[PDB]
Amino acid sequence: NEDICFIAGIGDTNGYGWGIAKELSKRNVKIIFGIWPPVYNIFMKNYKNGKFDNDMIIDKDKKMNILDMLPFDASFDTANDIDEETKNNKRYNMLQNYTIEDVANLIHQKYGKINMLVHSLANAKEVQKDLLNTSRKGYLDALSKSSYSLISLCKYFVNIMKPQSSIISLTYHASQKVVPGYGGGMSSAKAALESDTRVLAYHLGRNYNIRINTISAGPLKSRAATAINTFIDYAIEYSEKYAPLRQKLLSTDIGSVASFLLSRESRAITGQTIYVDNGLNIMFLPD
Amino acid sequence: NEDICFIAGIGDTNGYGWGIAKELSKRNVKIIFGIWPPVYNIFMKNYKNGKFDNDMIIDKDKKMNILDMLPFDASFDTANDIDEETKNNKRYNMLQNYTIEDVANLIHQKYGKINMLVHSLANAKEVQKDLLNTSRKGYLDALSKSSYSLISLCKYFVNIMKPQSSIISLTYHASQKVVPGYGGGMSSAKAALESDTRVLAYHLGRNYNIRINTISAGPLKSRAATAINTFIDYAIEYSEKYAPLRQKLLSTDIGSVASFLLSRESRAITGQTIYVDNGLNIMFLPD
Amino acid sequence: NEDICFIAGIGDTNGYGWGIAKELSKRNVKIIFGIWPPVYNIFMKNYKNGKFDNDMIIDKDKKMNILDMLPFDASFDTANDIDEETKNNKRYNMLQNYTIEDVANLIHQKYGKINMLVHSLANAKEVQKDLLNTSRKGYLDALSKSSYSLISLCKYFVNIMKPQSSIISLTYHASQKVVPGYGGGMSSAKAALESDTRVLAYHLGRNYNIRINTISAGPLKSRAATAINTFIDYAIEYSEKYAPLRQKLLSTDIGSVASFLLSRESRAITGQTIYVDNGLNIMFLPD
Amino acid sequence: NEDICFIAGIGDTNGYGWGIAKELSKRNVKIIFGIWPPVYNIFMKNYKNGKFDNDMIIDKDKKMNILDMLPFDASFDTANDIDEETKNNKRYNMLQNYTIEDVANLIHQKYGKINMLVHSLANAKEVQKDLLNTSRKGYLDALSKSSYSLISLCKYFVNIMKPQSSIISLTYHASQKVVPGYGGGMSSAKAALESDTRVLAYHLGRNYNIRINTISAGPLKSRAATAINTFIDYAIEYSEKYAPLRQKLLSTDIGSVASFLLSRESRAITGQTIYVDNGLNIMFLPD
Numbered sequence A, B, C, D: 001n002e003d004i005c006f007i008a009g010i011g012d013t014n015g016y017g018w019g020i021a022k023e024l025s026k027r028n029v030k031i032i033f034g035i036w037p038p039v040y041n042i043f044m045k046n047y048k049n050g051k052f053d054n055d056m057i058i059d060k061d062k063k064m065n066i067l068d069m070l071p072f073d074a075s076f077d078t079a080n081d082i083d084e085e086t087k088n089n090k091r092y093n094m095l096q097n098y099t100i101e102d103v104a105n106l107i108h109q110k111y112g113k114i115n116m117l118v119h120s121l122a123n124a125k126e127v128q129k130d131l132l133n134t135s136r137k138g139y140l141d142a143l144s145k146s147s148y149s150l151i152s153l154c155k156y157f158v159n160i161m162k163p164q165s166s167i168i169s170l171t172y173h174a175s176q177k178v179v180p181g182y183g184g185g186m187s188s189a190k191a192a193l194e195s196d197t198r199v200l201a202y203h204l205g206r207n208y209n210i211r212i213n214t215i216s217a218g219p220l221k222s223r224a225a226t227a228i229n230t231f232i233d234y235a236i237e238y239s240e241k242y243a244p245l246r247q248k249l250l251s252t253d254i255g256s257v258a259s260f261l262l263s264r265e266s267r268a269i270t271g272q273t274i275y276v277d278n279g280l281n282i283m284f285l286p287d
């Protein structure tokens, strides 16, 4: 079979994007990485130097098959949208075709139609500030990068997808219950993402027969998580202590659920927020 | 190597229990049926006369294999719970080891420990009456058979299940939003079942490292559905017209989700209500 | 001009029923108490000896006025439901007209139609046991007394209530999120009560133009709370430490919300679970 | 008592802002209107010409006491934020001090500290487009005007509010369930508003002892509603046909709930989305 999945939001092997790639790879899905330009050249260097080799082993027989790796910035819908400062940036200057539309066109031109799409990215320039102290520009940046990027990804990628294709993104329970520390409008962006997942499920389901769901993951010590204010150290310790299942949450635990939601096995599931967090979301009072 | 599942609530090939059996069988899980004594002998006679042979065809290069078929009544926790009248009733008189504790013991004696458990049953004497007109006895009957039966199944089966085992039941969205026609306290029972799934997830996760979830299924023209009164024809027509995914909901659509939730692929999911209903639950206003 | 409220579930001045009585009395609503026969004679003796006189002071320029105090047992729908044993029991033998239908009739005969109804009661034989260890009989007892009693109260009282009347009950968040210690099927009963509030809102709204809602209250050191085992001290301490509003939750805090929901001011609200808990329900992770 | 309420988002007498003003006026609350500059001069003219006189009657005794009416644009946090095109606009040119911070300063300078705040506004330049066809600028405009404006209002107004003050905004159930027609990212903005209400409740409750809630209203034929694509004619007809309570939803039905949430009567309620919609949100299947 010719399953191809574009994963937008891989920067190294420590986040959920990598775990999803690994699990899809087990099912013989061809994988294309969309890599944020500021970290693209570093990623390629680490890859070439074999830094990721142990992380690519699926088992005794299998290694991750990575079809391609492309620069991708969810800040920009089309070529016209890139500002002067960015195009002049040292790191963007030597790259091209990294807007959402350009990446869709490039994948389709090289490999044809795909049938799986993963949104595994977020950004918020004021994450370290409380919501109350977040500026209009800060808040809108969170929503632009973390929420609107999903809509744009759908809008441009549906043209290059087969009927019965499937899309997932990643969210966090701070959208629904208060997590002090989860600042800069990230909580807001995740609330919008979960709502948009429903509305998009209606549009994509009726028009194209395409499904879209979102996985609400528990805490993982990824690069981005490090940026929140040992906030991640706290979250992990609390989850491992109080969740119904006292076991370390792995990126591939989210990967196996993603793989299921992206396969035909879940053909009757759409518009849903699925919790993959060892059950922590169900608890009220710590015991 | 030895995935075994007990499916409590199969009476024919037209309901969700059969769809779950078929999909599990696809994955080489050995299946044991728990059949309610009022329908048990008709079920066995049909099976023996080859009435289900076509329904057991997976892909015509593969057919379902069933390990065992056992009389089972989720009304009774232990042998000591069985009233003299039932014990001597025409349909129960020839059967043995059909209470929850007895079937668990029997299964263990014959096959050892199991790792998958499916609650696919419900009942309510007054389902034809709206909630407001449901009697105390009718309401308690619905809770007893449809909700408490899950707790009891858990209590007795956890002793014959391996750590990391998984349990699922089936629910309906009338627990959360009003569905006229879903009467007799069935809505109440499903609300209880969904809440008990969380509390059980806590106890079973912490004490035995066992997971439990519930699938909120869309409408299927099963024998039980037809007996509600027609109600099910309206539900199905409405769902096929207004759901994000306008496709016929199959018992095997539920089956494949059940299969995922019972497998190790869903190891970080517990306490959850997972909707498998073509996304109908996400809609507010029709078109 | 003739607001009359029946409050089912008052046994002393330390619970939510009293707080609701006090706030309604503030608004010149006439109040009728429904008192469970095991505590009825001790309640009346305390009242007569002036034990509640201080507790009846509203602002020391105003004191509660109580229209009537009636023996009431929400276990029994009609006189024909009362087993011979209860009928002849030491505490029931001297009382009459204490079933749901009889109290409705009595109230109507004496005061005519009423327009406000409060369900402020719960009970569960096995509340000290975790759900997994709760017996069938214990679980059904919790559903019978704590959830079904609301449906029955509605069925019999709608005949003695005016159109545009309002009904409220009390619930707890353990229905939606796991609270260790809230056992015996009380969590199940509250999940059922909250679901039944919606279904009843539909029937009562459409057929009688009557509204029904439920208040999910935070912790209060009532007699029933103390009897759970300590559990309530932990709940209160936790709530005062971690709730958005760090202030002592009063029975009259619930009372003033109840008063609003029972008045015409809330005429467009029905079927709802309203949280009155200093906002604790909105929190995920503590500080 | 000196209760003062600023209501941001009044353009005429046909929306929810006016109904909230009317009901607060009954409680002798002094009212200040924040009026969007494009409609400020028209509003003032209609007011002066007596167009609103019949709409201001509370009853036999009372007329609405409007303390002041000020231009207010939720697009701009501070004086510096206004762009050239706006400052040059015919309608803005003759007005001043209409940014969020400027209005806070102006109210405080004229009247001192207030204790009630109402956010009753929304805008989305692409509301007529499906979410899938909404542009990045369109989507962010919705979030900026409809969601971030609430945060900014809180940030600047808390300085001029008393302890134990209360804040409300208005939302719609399209945040939670799909409403085709509710386009341009308005669904997204409302999801973010409901989430932000929780996070702000935590910050404002712990730091200032101030409460914040949001009212999810049913459909009302306001000026803004007219802009959605007879979408409002449909919504109203559907609500009056299918809601549990079959009665016309009035602006003052939302006003009376707002008045309660803004008063001390609701001191234990914060971070909540309260539905004031005749119960329509509780229904799954039309009957």
Ligand SMILES: NC(=O)c1ccc[n+]([C@@H]2O[C@H](COP(=O)([O-])OP(=O)(O)OC[C@H]3O[C@@H](n4cnc5c(N)ncnc54)[C@H](O)[C@@H]3O)[C@@H](O)[C@H]2O)c1
Residues within 6 Å of the ligand: A008, A009, A010, A011, A012, A014, A015, A016, A017, A035, A036, A039, A072, A073, A074, A075, A119, A120, A121, A122, A123, A145, A170, A171, A172, A216, A217, A218, A219, A220, A221, A222, A223, A224, A225
């Ligand atoms: N790590 C957790 O604890 C956790 C919990 C719940 C949800 N999530 C979600 O999972 C997703 C993946 O994050 P992660 O935890 O794997 O951290 P991560 O750093 O591994 O992944 C985030 C990636 O997004 C990329 N990115 C940032 N801005 C971008 C832009 N403008 N365009 C394109 N890419 C951009 C970064 O390069 C980074 O590689 C995020 O959406 C996050 O919200 C994470």
Ligand SMILES: NC(=O)c1ccc[n+]([C@@H]2O[C@H](COP(=O)([O-])OP(=O)(O)OC[C@H]3O[C@@H](n4cnc5c(N)ncnc54)[C@H](O)[C@@H]3O)[C@@H](O)[C@H]2O)c1
Residues within 6 Å of the ligand: B008, B009, B010, B011, B012, B014, B015, B016, B017, B035, B036, B039, B072, B073, B074, B075, B119, B120, B121, B122, B123, B145, B170, B171, B172, B216, B217, B218, B219, B220, B221, B222, B223, B224, B225
């Ligand atoms: N059919 C639907 O449309 C639908 C939609 C949502 C959820 N569900 C749920 O799926 C489950 C299966 O229902 P179905 O639709 O497959 O109908 P079904 O008739 O196929 O399943 C019901 C089975 O449960 C068995 N049963 C009843 N009482 C029992 C008892 N006391 N002990 C043991 N077994 C008993 C019956 O023998 C019957 O075979 C139910 O719990 C139902 O609530 C069904």
Ligand SMILES: NC(=O)c1ccc[n+]([C@@H]2O[C@H](COP(=O)([O-])OP(=O)(O)OC[C@H]3O[C@@H](n4cnc5c(N)ncnc54)[C@H](O)[C@@H]3O)[C@@H](O)[C@H]2O)c1
Residues within 6 Å of the ligand: C008, C009, C010, C011, C012, C014, C015, C016, C017, C035, C036, C039, C072, C073, C074, C075, C119, C120, C121, C122, C123, C145, C170, C171, C172, C216, C217, C218, C219, C220, C221, C222, C223, C224, C225
């Ligand atoms: N106390 C809390 O912390 C708390 C928190 C959330 C919800 N609630 C709810 O508030 C309600 C009132 O409880 P409370 O905390 O005021 O305790 P309480 O003791 O004041 O109220 C319970 C009352 O119900 C009566 N009752 C019990 N069984 C009855 C029956 N069969 N018929 C008639 N009356 C019966 C008892 O006489 C008792 O007076 C309960 O439903 C409870 O679930 C309480």
Ligand SMILES: NC(=O)c1ccc[n+]([C@@H]2O[C@H](COP(=O)([O-])OP(=O)(O)OC[C@H]3O[C@@H](n4cnc5c(N)ncnc54)[C@H](O)[C@@H]3O)[C@@H](O)[C@H]2O)c1
Residues within 6 Å of the ligand: D008, D009, D010, D011, D012, D014, D015, D016, D017, D035, D036, D039, D072, D073, D074, D075, D119, D120, D121, D122, D123, D145, D170, D171, D172, D216, D217, D218, D219, D220, D221, D222, D223, D224, D225
């Ligand atoms: N009308 C309904 O059916 C309905 C249902 C649910 C929720 N709501 C909500 O109620 C609130 C009030 O809307 P309405 O229905 O009364 O319509 P409305 O037109 O009466 O009120 C909206 C007001 O917001 C103002 N506004 C728009 N952009 C602004 C800006 N940038 N700065 C300041 N003010 C601005 C407009 O002048 C207008 O007067 C809205 O938030 C809406 O989402 C309305």
Ligand SMILES: O=Cc1ccc(Oc2ccc(Cl)cc2Cl)c(O)c1
Residues within 6 Å of the ligand: A121, A122, A123, A124, A125, A127, A171, A172, A186, A218, A219, A220, A224, A225, A228, A232, A235
């Ligand atoms: O522990 C919970 C947690 C940890 C990390 C997360 O990802 C991000 C958080 C903030 C930002 Cl700016 C970017 C990203 Cl990828 C997240 O969403 C939730």
Ligand SMILES: O=Cc1ccc(Oc2ccc(Cl)cc2Cl)c(O)c1
Residues within 6 Å of the ligand: B121, B122, B123, B124, B125, B127, B171, B172, B186, B218, B219, B220, B224, B225, B228, B232, B235
């Ligand atoms: O269309 C929705 C639907 C149809 C059938 C269902 O199953 C039952 C419903 C009532 C009773 Cl008494 C027993 C059973 Cl198995 C159900 O739960 C939901």
Ligand SMILES: O=Cc1ccc(Oc2ccc(Cl)cc2Cl)c(O)c1
Residues within 6 Å of the ligand: C121, C122, C123, C124, C125, C127, C171, C172, C186, C218, C219, C220, C224, C225, C228, C232, C235
């Ligand atoms: O702290 C939360 C809390 C405390 C008390 C409660 O009331 C009861 C709890 C159990 C039983 Cl059996 C009877 C009643 Cl009235 C309750 O519902 C929740």
Ligand SMILES: O=Cc1ccc(Oc2ccc(Cl)cc2Cl)c(O)c1
Residues within 6 Å of the ligand: D121, D122, D123, D124, D125, D127, D171, D172, D186, D218, D219, D220, D224, D225, D228, D232, D235
């Ligand atoms: O019927 C539901 C409904 C009707 C009107 C509404 O208000 C708006 C809707 C869109 C825009 Cl751009 C601005 C506003 Cl004030 C709304 O929120 C929901």
